[PDB]
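ligand=calcium ion
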Amino acid sequence: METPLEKALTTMVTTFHKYSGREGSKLTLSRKELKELIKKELCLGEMKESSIDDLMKSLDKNSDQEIDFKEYSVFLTMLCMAYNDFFLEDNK
Amino acid sequence: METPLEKALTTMVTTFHKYSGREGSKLTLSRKELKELIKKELCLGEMKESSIDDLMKSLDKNSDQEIDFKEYSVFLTMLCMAYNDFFLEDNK
Ligand SMILES: [Ca+2]
Ligand SMILES: [Ca+2]
Ligand SMILES: [Ca+2]
Ligand SMILES: [Ca+2]
């Protein structure tokens, strides 16, 4: 038995490991694998090419242009804060 | 239109603001709000009291004994790496 939150974490592992196998290492999202993933995973219109390549420059820790899981946790942090800050303007 | 990952992050924001609202300040998980949240989010059974008291003490960068949102992303990081390391014994 496993929660809808363990299934949420599993989905984050799913789109990560699945798209992380598009290129580079199978544990990294290259700047192409990440651009591929964001362009499917975040549907909200402004996921445009310079929005993603400047985001990428801030998600990455070293400019290797391969996103390791601890680089990728920066993405997950900002997105989980942004949906909270949305909820603070909607449920009020 | 918003993805199953945005709905996974929404689930995380929903459990978060609910338990992060349940003691101390409302954007922050106290040693009790966290011990609640973990034992609600993780069905594992090794989410035991001293495992959680070390985990809390290991999450709490600042020793204030609430978990701010940027403390809480460290929990989500360890879990997204642990379910990947699970997935690496199956989808090898
Ligand atoms: Ca890759
Ligand atoms: Ca990198
Ligand atoms: Ca609190
Ligand atoms: Ca703290």
